[PDB]
Design a protein around this ligand. Structure first.
Ligand code: HEM
Length: 291
């Protein structure tokens, strides 16, 4: 199953930087969403969920085709809550109708991280919309009530190794869980809309208590008011994961670098890039632009 990247006709860096800016500006202006957390976290969750359907065995799913736009995928119960990120982007697609769904959903994720003071994520254009019949079935995203073995095994299908898995979960400790959404409730840390390595720190230095939530699900709770999913907590149970958790807790920059590489790989899985394709773009932030 081959998916070759095709640059949107005649567009270049400037075109996409325009699209970046538009997303970044609305991020700035629609600041009260989710109790003034903003749309950042939901955008990077959306970029991960549309990429997380990929299966390295037959090259199905993945971000290439933008199939989250079809009812089947849009209505995946594991995607509950993502409708708000979709609706956020909708005005922008209208403003820039030449960009493909897949490029817009993945650039939304890159924009959020950079605007929330995360690392730069190089990004490549060229995803191409594919028909509804290419939509992956529900069920390829991970469960939260499982263990390390589960986590390790799951991510193998996305060709992610241990270091890559731990960098990706870390995920700047952004946003929170919502009971109505996932049957989980609460944030991973104090800065839910600044990209940091706080998750690693919190994991290792909080006092966690295994409790049941109002959705009758167990989660780990801290006196500080933070929470961890069973799959999150499993990272300190596994001896291989734990060592990496400790490395990222002790080195902000290493973590920043590692995440950038894994997130780009995640966004690019399944896509074939012609040698003649353009190099990846590195977008400047609003701040770097003085906007
Ligand atoms: C074993 C893997 C993972 C599991 C089981 C999982 C599960 C969860 C669940 C239960 C939520 C709550 C959704 C809601 O209630 O609104 C969620 C939120 C989110 N996750 Fe994941 N996830 C994992 C991996 C990832 C990774 C790899 C990233 C992205 C790089 C990611 C980014 C997010 C973010 C940003 C949120 C917060 C969204 C917002 O605040 O609305 N997750 N995750």
């Amino acid at each position: 199953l081959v998916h070759v990247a095709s640059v949107e006709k005649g567009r270049s860096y400037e075109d996409f930087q325009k699209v970046y800016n538009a997303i970044a500006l609305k991020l700035r202006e629609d600041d009260e969403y989710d109790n003034y957390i903003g749309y950042g976290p939901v955008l990077v969750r959306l970029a991960w969920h549309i990429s997380g359907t990929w299966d390295k065995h037959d090259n199905t799913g993945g971000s290439y085709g933008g199939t989250y736009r079809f009812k089947k995928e849009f209505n995946d119960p594991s995607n509950a809550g993502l409708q708000n990120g979709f609706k956020f982007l909708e005005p922008i697609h209208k403003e820039f109708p030449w960009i493909s769904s897949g490029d817009l959903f993945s650039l939304g994720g890159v924009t959020a991280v950079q605007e929330m003071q995360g690392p730069k994520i190089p990004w490549r254009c060229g995803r191409v919309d594919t028909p509804e019949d290419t939509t992956p079935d529900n069920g390829r995203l991970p469960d939260a009530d499982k263990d390390a073995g589960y986590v390790r095994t799951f991510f193998q299908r996305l060709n992610m190794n241990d270091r890559e898995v731990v960098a990706l979960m870390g995920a700047g400790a952004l946003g929170k869980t919502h009971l109505k959404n996932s049957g989980y409730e609460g944030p991973w840390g104090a800065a839910n809309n600044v990209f940091t390595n706080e998750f690693y720190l919190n994991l290792l230095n909080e006092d966690w208590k295994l409790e049941k939530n109002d959705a009758n699900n167990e989660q780990w709770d801290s006196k500080s008011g933070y929470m961890m999913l069973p799959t999150d907590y499993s990272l300190i149970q596994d001896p291989k994961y734990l060592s990496i958790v400790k490395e990222y807790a002790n080195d902000q920059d290493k973590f920043f670098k590692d995440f950038s590489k894994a997130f780009e790989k995640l966004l690019e899985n399944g896509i074939t890039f012609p040698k003649d394709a353009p190099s990846p773009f590195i977008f400047k932030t609003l701040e770097e632009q003085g906007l």
